[PDB]
Amino acid sequence: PTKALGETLNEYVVVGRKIPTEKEPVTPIWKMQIFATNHVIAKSRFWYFVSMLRRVKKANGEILSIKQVFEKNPGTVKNYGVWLKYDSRTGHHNMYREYRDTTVAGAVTQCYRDMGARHRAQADRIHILKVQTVKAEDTKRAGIKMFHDAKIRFPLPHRVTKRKNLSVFTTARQNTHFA
Amino acid sequence: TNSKGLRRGTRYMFARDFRKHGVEHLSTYYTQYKRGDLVDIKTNGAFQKGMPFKAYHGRTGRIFNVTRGAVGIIVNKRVRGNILPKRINIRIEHIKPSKCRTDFLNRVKSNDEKRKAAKSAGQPVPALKRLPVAPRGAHTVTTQNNEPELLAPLRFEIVA
Amino acid sequence: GIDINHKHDRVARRTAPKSENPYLRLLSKLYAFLARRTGEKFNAIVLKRLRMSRRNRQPLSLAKLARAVQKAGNENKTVVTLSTVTDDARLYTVPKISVAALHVTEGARARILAAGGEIITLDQLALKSPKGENTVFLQGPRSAREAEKHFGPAPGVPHSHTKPYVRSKGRKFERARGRRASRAYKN
Amino acid sequence: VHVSGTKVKVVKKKLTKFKRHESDRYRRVAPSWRKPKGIDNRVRRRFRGMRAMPTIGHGSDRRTRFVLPNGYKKVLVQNVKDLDMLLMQSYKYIGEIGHGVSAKSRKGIVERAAQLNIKLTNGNARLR
Amino acid sequence: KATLPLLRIIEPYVAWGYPNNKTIHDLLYKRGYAKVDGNRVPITDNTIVEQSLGKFNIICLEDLAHEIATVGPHFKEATNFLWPFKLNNPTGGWTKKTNHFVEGGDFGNREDQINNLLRKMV
């Protein structure tokens, strides 16, 4: 089944259309924003969704273009809202989730990992209906809202540090508190 | 085990089509059959004489004999690891001309005519070969009055 | 692993005559050399028929030789056969025949030589026509054996004319049931 | 070593003997190899950890097959006249006096081989 | 249309894609073997190509590469002249070999990523 393999899913814009026939010399052009590991998966998913929405399949259609989309300014932090629909072991549900990221692709990757973590849902059972940037005042999730503070501050309470390239045994005393 | 009568399991195979019973139209008898022609076999239940066996229903055969109201046909039948050319005497009512051979004969006629015309007119010999449909060529698609329509997956709705 | 079939990898063949006849082995040697070096399919055919078994070399008839030489253009050609040339009592006139053969019976040899003909061996043919020029290749009828009459569809099969293996011939020997409609049936 | 008269090295694919299965378990079963024919024989079925079976793939190199550790091939000699066959290819063949040759004849054989410059495998044997 | 159905039938057992210039040239130069009288002969010289494809004006490995890449009139002869390439296992390993490329696996049509795979296999 389709999997969200890869760190930081890529984002593609895929434009396609049904192949013109005699009865329909000109056909509508459809465009989708897809989040996938590579462009082959992007094209396959585009056809999946377009065949779900309109009476056309990969056989009778063609891909006019497929272009990767890169974050304009990855140097700024944004709040992203994700509207998704997913299948549980029992029924179908709609969810709205929020993340904080510098890239929309990063936010969607976070969404996939979070859905897997909290609901044991795999990528084949998730549909990303919509992703947008929400304003700080328009967020509605406590985990995200708690970081909308200009005076945010906190320590690192119990730091367990791993020795990397040196013997297993030592006489040193390990310290977990750093003030 | 099953019984081994001639018409076992032919309940629908030998039945007439819906609203197609009754008198058999006469083009069936006016059709011309010559030895060497290819014919499709489709039993007509309304005629119980000269009926093909159910194994030959829906098969194509080559005519080897032409009698007063029937034809002898050579039909391939698979028996274990060999194909046997069985000979069957079938009446005209269960027979129909096969278009596959006639299409090929027409293509041969067209090929010969095209070759003759090109040679007589001094043109280079044309290409007379069927070719598999090749992948589509390069082209440009214009968006004027055809702006792309942005699609998104739809939310789940409880359709009670 | 590779997906291939080994059932027909090996092809049974004769790379030398099965016979211990030293002269036959020498002839096979000579014509192996000729076939390999001259590169002539005529030499290849002679080699194969030298190595063949006596079943595939059925006797030829002086009448067949005469018919071959009496054809327009074959008068001065050398008839090459690896089958025994036998005498035909039904042949009345023998033309002038030049024949290269392994063995020619006494009667056939006498008649051929009396009619002004010539008989040479395969070694002599190797010198006369190293590439097989001006030759008429002949052989006896391979399917004209009593055993072959017993080969084919079984005797008790429809439209079968195979000779059965009967102890004797007579009204009491396999002629009653399955051979006439008066007794059960007839195929 | 190298085959005498050449530079090709002698290689042994295997040095142990293909001993018959269960010959170590029963005295009635001699060690001489016999191909197992039993339906359930694990050696025949080639289970891991089982003794190997002789195969043509174990065959020695053609250039070094039958060559003794000193680099020569053995030829058996029964009398003085048998020494002639070793005269020409003496750089690759080594003579060996047959077992049944008596001490009376071995003296002459050894002396003639020394004269002819033909090496012997058991020259200094059966001295009475 | 006469070959794509075969590629759909054999989907679970093959990885295929669209080779590019470097892929074709690497395949030909590093692993090119000819079928000469039923024998697998390495193509170490251009004369080997010429002896079998000279009648079609294909005299060099570059001519062969062009014929393959552009699908010339003698594509069938050019490709049948080549022994099936016997490639090495990729250095880096496979991914699943039991799932389509779009399922995060290996089999099926990888499009132009067959070049990425072949850069490790060849």
Next chain:
Amino acid sequence: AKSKNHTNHNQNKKAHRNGITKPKKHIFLSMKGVDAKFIKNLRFSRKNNKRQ
């Protein structure tokens, strides 16, 4: 001890092992089983055509 046990399990493999042999090409040349009157007229027609 039931011993009927019919099955068609390994039969296509056996059939295909030596290939499925299609009928020959000369089978359409024989004039066997053709109308006797037509055959008689064919004999008469062939017995009379002058060779040259």
Next chain:
RNA sequence: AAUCAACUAGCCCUGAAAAUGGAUGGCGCUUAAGCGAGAGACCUAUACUCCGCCGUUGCGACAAGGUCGUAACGAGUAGGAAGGUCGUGGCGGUUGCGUUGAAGGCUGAGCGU
């Protein structure tokens, strides 16, 4: 300064009782060495690539029941063939050894898949 209600589904808990002492394979593991989504690298087949050798098959060279070259290949019960300067006992012939020690017997240096 958020609260209330009804639902929903992840993990956990109850529902959850059997007889020799006992089983995520065992030890053990708790920001795991568990559950889900992922990433780098790494390990490992008689598989794949390349290199050597043996043989089979196909083809080929050579004045030879032989040698050599070359490419591909090598699972196997019942069963079928081929080769055996593998082994045993006679006969017609041929080659030799032997009371200075044959056959037989015990057992080191080698040869052959």
Next chain:
RNA sequence: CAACGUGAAUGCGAGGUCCAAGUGGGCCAUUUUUGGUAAGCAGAACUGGCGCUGUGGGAUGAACCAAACGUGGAGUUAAGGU
């Protein structure tokens, strides 16, 4: 008799005859399916296997996953794992 000249893709050499062995208890699996409450039960269809078969993995196992085997070596992997 005259002329015309090979008319989809891909792969590949093709055909013929004779003589004869063993076998004629099968079993398993995805999918479909009949009897039965069910069964490691009984009976069928297509295909692949085990039987006849080792090898890496599933702690162990005829059938599961990977992959089929001359005899050695170097490198890389499959399924599986660290």
Next chain:
RNA sequence: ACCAUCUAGUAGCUGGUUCCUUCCGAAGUUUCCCUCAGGAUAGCUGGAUCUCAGGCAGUUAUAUUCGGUAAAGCUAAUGAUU
């Protein structure tokens, strides 16, 4: 009963059936049999080879056909049925 012989009685049944390498390599299915632990028969398999040097294929394409299963229907016939 015992003794010798016919008698090495017959057995579709049980047990055994003795050297090595190489190559190829199955079947438990059809039909008939007082047939069901067995045979004959076809199939599967080996060997000998022979005739030749492009027509074939457990694959596609094109063209043309066959079918009444899944789904669908019962506000279409038959049969139920609120």
Next chain:
RNA sequence: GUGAAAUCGCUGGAGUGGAACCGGAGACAGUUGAUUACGCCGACGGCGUUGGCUGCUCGUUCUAGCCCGACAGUGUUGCGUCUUGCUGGCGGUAGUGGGUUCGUGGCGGCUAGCGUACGUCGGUGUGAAAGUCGACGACGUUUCCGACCCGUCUUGAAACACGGAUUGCGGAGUGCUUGUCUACUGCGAGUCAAAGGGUGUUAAAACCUUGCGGCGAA
């Protein structure tokens, strides 16, 4: 006469925790070989082949940010159509300028197996003998990995299925009649000749001999 195996006793060596045996790979013990050039071995370089790891550098694709302009908003400093910040699209790109993608690209570094366009060198061996060197190390010991008892019937055997305590010797597809096919030999419209006869004294052999008989020619 010879005097095997099973089984058994002694002497010496070595192992010895609820089996023992066995395959692969070493080590030890032990056995055995050893004529400047040449053998038997090693090391370091070169070359060929198959590699493994690891860097720079150009370019290609798709794309920015920085920077400028207006507009909208606000997790905002300092003292409110304020200001400083910060964000968002939109319009610019001159300059600066990173990501992504890969090239029938260019230049490197470390290193492995196999073979020998081949070099530079060492150990040993040319009477013995000792030592040294080399190879084995085989039914001894010890380690690491693997390792269930064979034959058989069976869908399925290590089986809580049957036979097998051990060793020697013996032990089972034969003879003949009749068919058929195949291979080889002789002759060939023929071929083989029977019983018999004649002769043969290294005389049961060999040699010669058929109006007639067998099979074949309808």
